[PDB]
Design an enzyme around this catalytic site. Structure first.
Site, PDB file in Angstrom:
ATOM      1  CG  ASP B 148      -1.940  -0.690   0.790  1.00 31.19           C
ATOM      2  OD1 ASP B 148      -2.311  -1.933   0.237  1.00 31.19           O
ATOM      3  OD2 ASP B 148      -2.699  -0.497   2.250  1.00 31.19           O
ATOM      4  CG  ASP B 270     -19.657  -2.122  13.948  1.00 39.55           C
ATOM      5  OD1 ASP B 270     -20.558  -1.889  14.659  1.00 39.55           O
ATOM      6  OD2 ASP B 270     -19.169  -1.618  13.323  1.00 39.55           O
TER       7      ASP B 270
END
Lengths: 387, 385
Positions: B148, B270
């Site tokens: 990246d 979550d």
């Protein structure tokens, strides 16, 4: 007829002072005590049109400097002393509790103590200045006024002052961004309106205070709507390196590559008692720092087009570096050709050493040098609030 | 047809795909998540229906890969046989890795040694490599690392240095390294096609928004500056006010600031819950306004890298590709720069569709769906041929 104010600006290594008529801006004394807590401790002042300098004694700091002001400088002129109507102190941080200038009492002092965590380096210095002022001028003890560098920036909306972190950070703790050099940004904003011949309340400009620390603000319709002191993130946190401890050849190079070579703010900025951000080993190291600085400066200015709502009237340069360092203005604006900036070389050279002026090519976006006068604003505020 | 298994392994999840490196065809995609938790699970899409299964309580990377091999691909031995290479997303390649590389022992060490820069990512990548070597032993010599940070290594020192003593770089390698560089790379190549010009002449500002995005300045097709990781829309001791100040002014994560000065981190995430975390309309609006304000500032800041010419702004990523109001609200602030969004074009360019979203005759603004998995497949195939 006149309202003279003693202005004190205490920092970790120095004390800048003046006596100023708040009615019309006349200066009766100005000066700088510097190299505090060192063998080189000294004081430079200007009075009756003449410049003077004395040693303060090895290790001297604020108490000594104020002592010299009262017992040597003002002792020659009890008539000046007799005219003093108030004392104005430049204070870095007032937070949300003090959004404008205020007469100093015990709770204001407590407010300053509680703000120690903001520019902590200068925090003791402010308090010592207030303590010594009250002692040396007992007659003015209820007429000391605090003038806050955060105050001008209190108009920022929450989208500007909130960190990019959970809202609870602010809701629960009150963590928030605040801004630097507010008295200077305020001053140059009022002046820009006159130079551009328009109402301050219609003024959309970007103001660059480059001095002891560097900050950039976005002004929309005359009010600050965003600001950053990210050009010098460690200012007020970390001492840095005394300019005089660096090889003189490196410093000459720095000053020349800044565009400060001839062809009060200036005395301070070229002082060998000025502290710089890194201990430059070489000329190349110094130039690198300057190039990084100009790059970041250009980014701040570009970034604040996002606050202009389609109209930018001018970019303003001010402070010890902004008023004098023509190459900082050239190199930063030169990176923003896409915005229609173009620096006029002759105009840029002329707008140095206390001269104000436009530095853009006429017909391209206005860029202006406006020498700041923080001392005058402090005087006006100190006089206004004690009358 | 050259099939590549593309992996992106995090501390608590593993994203995977099988991509034809020749034409971009997708044969499999999915995400395994909630690792080290009771609710560890895997979702995938193939032929071309969506499925999901539990991986088992406490499951992680090895179970996820075992599932891919023995449940997902057990029914597709031809897919398994056509796998030619494995590509791994690596968050940090430091200054050393400026392009993609076949993974050998020295690359493993490279990733290890530079874990300090990305302590919550680089270690998970290594597990992913270790597990892939086991699960796909036929491809053991055909694993490739795609970094990246590589696209960002063209940044000059005036951009990559923080406003800090130079010794921090010289002695400790403290520097901007960038994020999402595979995505910024990809949309840079695609933007040159949309603008009908050579990539070597392309001056753009690219906004990868989603998954802690970033904004980069591209001049003549090369990254010349890049932002810190953005906070996603879900947003004796030194005073914390100083830490946040330093974070904000330097453009350095709170963690890298502290630094330079059994996943507990996911225990309340979550994926663990059926119901949702509550967010009021007022709080959502505030968060949006802060995000779009900061985004517009980044875009304006990079005009300082453009040397007089800005061809376009580019939006990409899970938010950038899909969130019309983020684009409208942030560009809406940049009228000085000549930006104005057209609502109808803006709404058209969503959910995988590309296009111009600027009003005709205003500065180009373009949505380009990113395809990091294709870039990784491309590099893996090319480097192992």
């Amino acid at each position: 007829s006149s309202k003279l104010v003693l202005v004190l600006n205490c920092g970790s290594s120095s004390l800048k002072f003046a006596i100023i008529d708040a009615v019309n801006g006349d200066e009766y004394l100005s000066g700088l005590a510097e190299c505090f807590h060192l063998p080189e401790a000294r004081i430079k002042w200007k009075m009756d049109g003449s410049k003077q300098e004395a040693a303060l004694g090895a290790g001297a700091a604020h108490s000594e400097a104020l002592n010299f002001i009262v017992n040597t400088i003002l002792a020659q002129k009890p008539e000046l002393s007799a005219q003093l109507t108030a004392i104005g102190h430049r204070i870095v941080h007032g937070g949300e509790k003090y959004t404008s200038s205020v007469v100093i009492d015990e709770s204001v002092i407590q407010g300053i103590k509680d703000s120690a965590s903001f520019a902590p380096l200068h925090n003791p210095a402010h308090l010592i200045g207030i303590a010594e002022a009250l002692k040396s001028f007992p007659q003015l003890k209820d007429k000391n006024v605090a003038v806050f560098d955060t105050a001008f920036h209190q108009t920022m909306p929450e989208e500007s002052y909130l960190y990019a972190l959970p809202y609870s950070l602010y809701k629960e703790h009150g963590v928030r961004r605040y801004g630097a050099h507010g008295t200077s940004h305020f001053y140059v904003t009022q002046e820009a309106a006159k130079m551009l011949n328009k109402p301050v309340e219609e003024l959309n400009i970007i103001t660059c205070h480059l001095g002891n620390g560097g900050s950039v603000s976005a002004i929309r319709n005359g009010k600050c709507v965003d600001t950053s002191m990210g050009l010098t993130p460690l200012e007020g946190l970390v001492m840095g390196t005394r300019s005089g401890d660096i090889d003189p050849a490196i410093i000459f190079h720095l000053h020349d590559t800044l565009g400060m070579s001839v062809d009060l703010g200036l005395t301070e900025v070229t002082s060998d008692c000025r502290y710089v951000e890194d201990n430059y080993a070489t000329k190349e190291d110094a130039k690198r720092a300057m190039d990084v600085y100009c790059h970041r400066l250009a980014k701040y200015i570009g970034s604040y087009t996002a606050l202009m709502d389609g109209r930018l009237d001018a970019v303003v340069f001010t402070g010890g570096i902004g008023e004098n360092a023509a190459m900082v203005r050239e190199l930063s604006l030169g990176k923003l050709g896409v915005l229609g900036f173009e620096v006029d070389h002759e105009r840029n050279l002329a707008a140095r050493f206390g001269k104000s002026g436009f530095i853009n090519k006429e017909g391209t976006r206005p860029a202006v040098v406006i020498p700041t006068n923080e001392e005058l604003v402090i005087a006006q505020d100190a006089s206004r609030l004690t009358a």
